[PDB]
Write an enzyme that holds these catalytic residues in place. Sequence first.
Site: not given
Lengths: 54, 331, 429, 437
Positions: D11, D140, D143-145, D254
Site C-alpha cells: 500500500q 514500507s 507492512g507485511g507486503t 552515480e
Amino acid sequence: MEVIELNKCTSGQSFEVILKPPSDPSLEEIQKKLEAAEERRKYQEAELLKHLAE
Amino acid sequence: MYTFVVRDENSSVYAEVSRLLLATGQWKRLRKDNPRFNLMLGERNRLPFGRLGHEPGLVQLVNYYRGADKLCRKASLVKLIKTSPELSESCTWFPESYVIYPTDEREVFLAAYNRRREGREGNVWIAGILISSEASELLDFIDEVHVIQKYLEKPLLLEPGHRKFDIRSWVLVDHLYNIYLYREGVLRTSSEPYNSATCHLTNHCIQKEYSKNYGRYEEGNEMFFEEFNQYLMDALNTTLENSILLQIKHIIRSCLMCIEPAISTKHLHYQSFQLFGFDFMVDEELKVWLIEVNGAPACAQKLYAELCQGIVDVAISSVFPLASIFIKLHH
Amino acid sequence: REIVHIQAGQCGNQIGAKFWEVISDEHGIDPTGSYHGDSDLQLERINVYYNEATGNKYVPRAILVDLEPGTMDSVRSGPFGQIFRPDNFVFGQSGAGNNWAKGHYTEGAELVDSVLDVVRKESESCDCLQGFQLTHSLGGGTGSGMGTLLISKIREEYPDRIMNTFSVMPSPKVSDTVVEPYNATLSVHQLVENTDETYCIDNEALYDICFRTLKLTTPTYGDLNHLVSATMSGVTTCLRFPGQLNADLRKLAVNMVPFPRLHFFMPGFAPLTSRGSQQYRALTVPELTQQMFDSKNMMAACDPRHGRYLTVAAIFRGRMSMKEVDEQMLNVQNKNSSYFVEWIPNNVKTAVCDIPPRGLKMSATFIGNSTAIQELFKRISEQFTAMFRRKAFLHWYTGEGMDEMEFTEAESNMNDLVSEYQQYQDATA
Amino acid sequence: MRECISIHVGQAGVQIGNACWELYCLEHGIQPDGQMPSDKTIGGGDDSFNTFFSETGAGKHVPRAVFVDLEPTVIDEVRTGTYRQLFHPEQLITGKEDAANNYARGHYTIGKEIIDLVLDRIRKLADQCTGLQGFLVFHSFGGGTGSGFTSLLMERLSVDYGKKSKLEFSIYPAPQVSTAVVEPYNSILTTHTTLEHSDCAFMVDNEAIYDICRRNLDIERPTYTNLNRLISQIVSSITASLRFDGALNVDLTEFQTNLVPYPRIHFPLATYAPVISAEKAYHEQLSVAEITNACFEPANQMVKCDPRHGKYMACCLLYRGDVVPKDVNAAIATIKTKRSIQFVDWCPTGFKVGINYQPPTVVPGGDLAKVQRAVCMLSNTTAIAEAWARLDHKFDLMYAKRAFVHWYVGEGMEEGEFSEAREDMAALEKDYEEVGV
Ligand SMILES: Nc1nc2c(ncn2[C@@H]2O[C@H](COP(=O)(O)OP(=O)(O)OP(=O)(O)O)[C@@H](O)[C@H]2O)c(=O)[nH]1
Ligand SMILES: Nc1ncnc2c1ncn2[C@@H]1O[C@H](COP(=O)(O)OP(=O)(O)CP(=O)(O)O)[C@@H](O)[C@H]1O
Ligand SMILES: *[C@]12O[C@@]3(C)CC[C@H](OC(=O)[C@@H]1[C@H]1[C@@H]4[C@H]5[C@H](O)[C@@H](C)[C@H](O)[C@@H]5C=C(C)[C@@H]4C[C@H]13)[C@H]2C
Ligand SMILES: Nc1nc2c(ncn2[C@@H]2O[C@H](COP(=O)(O)OP(=O)(O)O)[C@@H](O)[C@H]2O)c(=O)[nH]1
Ligand SMILES: [Ca+2]
Ligand SMILES: [Mg+2]
Ligand SMILES: [Mg+2]
Ligand SMILES: [Mg+2]
C-alpha cells in the site's frame, strides 16, 4: 573553497565545492529456503489435523 | 500530571531533585525503562539521546547536553580551547597545556619546556597525579590519555595558614541556553601550609584522608563566599566580586558560548539542561585561571537544598509549570 | 473479504438476532433486505456481512443453529426475522438440556453435519473468506457444547481461516442452572485451542451495568442483549466500514494476540447513560475517552487495574475532533502507563469512524487484551471445583458417555490458562 | 539514454508511486491521457525523460513502472484514477489476501505464489529497454507486503539482474500513523534480508513527514494524501537528475559513487526546504542562503536525528529554481562558519551541487505553495543510525518475551531468523559507531 567540474547546460548546471581535503545467494539457495519454510507449514498443519483426528 | 525517570542512582544532586519533584505532588516517578516520561534524569555514560523526543504527545527534557563532554574531559578541553578561534591558543585565562598519549603534541611540550628552563623562569608542570620539575619523570609516569599543563607556582594563599585553595562554581544551563551562575560558590581549601619545595592538591577527599589539619580553619576545608569576601576586604582591600567574580563570569560565558552551536537543543525534537561544576585557581596577582569543568558535579552539603530547588524552578518547572539564587550571564 | 456468521443456542440466537438488527440499521438495510440509506459508506464494505441476491437484496451471511426450535421460531417472527435466508435455519427438536455433553457428543453430533453443509455453501460463495464469527453462551448446552463442536469441525475444514467468537460467560448472579460452571469450563479449553479471538462477555457485568449505571431496577435478558449487540456493532465497526486499523480479522488478531492462547478480550462501551433528561447531554472527547477506559463500562466483570494491558484497540464513532481523539488517547497511556506492559511498545491502536451508532451522536468501543481477564477464569474454576470435589451433578454428563477424567483435564487446562496470564502480569522489561 | 524501472510494493509503495508519477507528468507536461504535446518525436526517442517513460506509436508516454500488492483495493484505485490511461493491465499486479502485517506471510507464504508472476511482468518492461540501468523500489518497512515481499523480490532481482543497480525509497514506521504493533519486527527482518541487495536506500520516517505537515503546512491531522504529496516532492528532487538534462547523478551508479563509500552504510539522510503552506496568500520568498541553511535544521530532515553528533561521508545539494552557483558558494561559506559540519577524516569536506532551473512543480489544489527556489540535500551522515537504535530497541523489548513471534513461525519462518536479523542490525549500529566517532 574551490569550485570544480562546472558543467553548464540549458536546464541548469552542476559543480563540486571542496572546503578541505581528506586528512549473492543463488537461485537454488533461495528456493531451498522457501521450500523449507513451506514444508514447516505443511508439517505444522499435518500435526494439527492429526490432533483433530484424535 | 508530569512523569520523570531516574537513571543515575549515584547522583546526589538529582536524588534531591527527584525527592523535591515527588514532594510537589504533581510529578510521578516511572520505572527507569518506561519511555512515556516528560523528564529524564539520565545516566552518566551512554545516555540514549537518540531515543529522546520520539514520543507523540510528550514534551521530553533531559538533564544533560549531548556533546558537553568536549568541555568536561581533560584532553577534550585542551583541544577545544586550542582549536576554537573563540578561545584561541592566545587564551589568557587557561594555563598552558598539552595532550600526550602513552605507550599527540608531546614534541611541542618539550619545545616550550626547553625555552622555559633555560631562561630559569620557573618550570613546574602537573600531570593518581604527580607534580614534577623534570619532564623525564612526567613522561615516565604516564606510560604506565593524559595532559600536562603549567603548574601555577604563585597561588593566592589564605592567611592565617599560608593555605592553597580552589574555587568551585555551579552553573546551570537551561533549555533556552540561559546561563545561570549559582550565587553560592565554595573554596575547597588545603589545611596544610603551602610548601614550595599533599598541600598542593585541594581535593576534599585528599584533604580528608592525607591531611593533618582537616577542618581547623573552616568546617570541612570549605570556605564559602561570605567568609572569603570578608577576607579579601580585610587582607587585600578588595571584594570577591571585583577581584575574582568578573573573571569567573567571563570564563564561564566564553566556554559555554563557544560550544553552543554544537550542543544547543533550540530547534531539537527534545530539550536539554545541564548542571556544570567549574573549577578555578587564583594566583597572587588575583588573576583567575580555569582548571577544569565537571559535567556531573556534587554540591556542598550546606547548599544542596538551595541549589536543587533552584534546578526545579529554573530548569524543570520552566518547561513543565506547576499549578533568584542565580546570576544570569547575558549574551 | 466475506465473514461467515454463526449463532448457536438460545443466548447465541437472541444476541445474534439483535446484532443483525443493529448493523442492518447502520448499513441502511430494512427487514425486507432492501437498502434505503443515504450514504455510500453504508454499502462500501457491505459484502463483509451480507450477500447480494437478485433485485439488489442483501442477505446476512448468517447461519442460525439450535437443538430445539423455540428460539429460532421467535427470531423468524422477530423484527428482522424475514431477512435471514430460510435454508440457513438449522435446528433439531430434542434440545440440549443445558448439557455440554449433549451439545458436544450426542444430540449435537447428530445435527452438526447439517450445519457444516450450510457453512460450506456460504463459504463456497466467497471469493476471499476471512473466517467465521460465532455468537453463543458458554453456560448452556447448544451454544457451549455444540458451538465448540462446530468450531473444531470448521477448523478441520478451514484451518487457514480466522475463528472469532462472542462468548457469554455465566455468572451465578444471572444463572439458569447450577451446571453452568461445568459447561463453561469444558468450553473454555475448546476456545483456548480453536479460536483466534474471543470477546468475553460476562452476564454479571451486563446486569450490573443495567442496574447500577442505567438505573434499570429489574434487568431482563433483553436489556442485557441491548448492551451486547451495541458492543458487537462497535467492535466490528472496523470490519464493516472503510478504515486502516484492524480492517480484517487477521490483521486484528496480529495486533491483539501476542501469545496464541491469550486471545480473550474484555470489551467495553461508552457512553452508558441513564434514560431521562441526562441522555440528551453532549459528550466531549475527554469524557467519552475516560468513560471507555472506566472499569464500570467494561463487560467481563474484571478490574483492569488488577492486571496489565498487553494490547488495546479503541474505536470512536461519530463526528468529533480526530486531533482531540489522538490527544486524549495519548493522555490515557501517558497518565497511567503502569497499566500497559512496557515490553509491547505502542500497544494501543485507535480507529475513528464518522458514522455514529443509532441513538448516539458519539460513542467509543474498547477492546482490551488484559491479564486481569484471569479473574474471570479463576471465578469459573472456583465454582467448578466446589461442585466437582463432590462429583455433584456429574451424572447428567456420564449419562451421555463422558468420563470423570475429561472433567479433571478441563479443570487442569483452565488452571494452566490462569497461571499463563499470571506469567505476564509480573513480567517486566 | 539508459532506462530505469520503478517498482511499487504494498500500500505505501503504491500510493507513494501514484503521487510521484502524477508529479512526473506535471513536471514533463504529460497529460493524464499519456500524450506529451512538447515531445516532437512521436513513438520513440532517447531523451532524458525516456529514462522513466516509454512511448507507444500513438504517442502515449507510459511509465516504466510495476505496481504489486497482495490485495486489490489499493491498486484498483490506480486502475480508475486520473492517470488510469497511463498504465496497461500488465503493469498492475494484485493478489487476493494480503500479508496481514506479517513479514513471514509476505516473504514465504504469499510471496512464493506471486514472485514468478511479478518477475515476468518486470521482464516485459526490461525487454523494452535498450540499456536498463536498474530499479527504484518503493515500499514500507512496516507492512507485511512492503517488508516481506520486497526482500524476496530484491533477492531475485540480484539473481536475474546481477549487474543492475537497485535503489530504495523506504517508509520507516511511526506510531502516529502506524497500523501494526509488529512493525519493528518487519522493519528489522526486511532490512536484514535486503541489506546486501540494495545499493542506496532513502529512508523516510513518517514521523518527520507528519510533523512537517503539521508545522509547516498547518494541517492538524495529516492524511496519507498530505504525506505522499510531500514525499513525492522529495522523491522528485532525488530523481530529477535521471529525468532532465544535467551532469550530476545522471545514472543510478552515480548515486552510489557520490553518496555511499561503504556498501553497508548506504542510507543517505534527505533534507528538504522550503515547505510552505499554500493557504498563505503571500510568503516572503526565501533566499539561496536561507533554504541552504535550512538543510542543516533537524526539523526539515526526512528522519529526525542530530547530524552534529555524527560524521558526514558525502553531501549532495540538489537545487530547483532560480539558483546560481555564486549564491550557493556564498551560502556554504557562511554556513560552514556557523554550524557543526564534520566529515570523516578520509573524505573531503565538500559538496556536490546540482542546479535545475525549473522550480518545483506543485500539484494543483495541493497543500504546498509554489516557491521560486527549493533544495534537497542528500547527506550520508552516521547520525541516521539513531533511527536503527530506536527500531532495534523496540525489537529487543518484544522479542525478549517472544511477543507475536508465533505469527511468524506459523508461516514457516524459523525463530532463528529473528536473532540472525537482529545481530546484523547490531553489526550495522557498530559500523556507524566506528565511522562516527
Ligand atoms: N507515507 C505513507 N505511509 C504509508 C502509506 N500507506 C501505508 N503507510 C505506512 O506503511 C506501514 C504499513 O504498511 P503497508 O504498506 O500499508 O502494508 P502492506 O505493504 O500493504 O503489507 P500488508 O497490507 O500487510 O500486506 C505503516 O507504517 C503505515 O503508516 C502511505 O500511503 N504513505
Ligand atoms: N595547573 C595547576 N596549578 C595549580 N594547582 C593545580 C593545577 N591543576 C590542578 N591543580 C590542583 O589539582 C586539584 C585537582 O586536580 P583536577 O582539578 O585537575 O582534577 P579533579 O578531578 O581532582 C577536580 P574535581 O574534584 O572538581 O573533579 C585541584 O584542587 C587543584 O588545586
Ligand atoms: C442502547 O443503550 C442505552 C444504554 C444507550 C446507548 C445506545 O442508545 C440507545 O438508544 C439504547 C438505550 C436503550 C433504551 C431505549 O432508548 C428505549 C427504547 C428503552 O428504554 C431501551 C432500554 C435500554 C436498556 C437501553 C438503554 C439505552 C444503545 C446501546
Ligand atoms: N446475555 C444473555 N445471556 C443469556 C441469554 N439467554 C441465556 N443466557 C445465558 O446463557 C446461559 C444459558 O445457555 P443457553 O444459551 O440458554 O443454552 P443453550 O440453548 O443450550 O445454548 C446462561 O449463562 C444464561 O445466563 C440472553 O438472551 N442473553
Ligand atoms: Ca519522443
Ligand atoms: Mg574532575
Ligand atoms: Mg436457555
Ligand atoms: Mg496492504
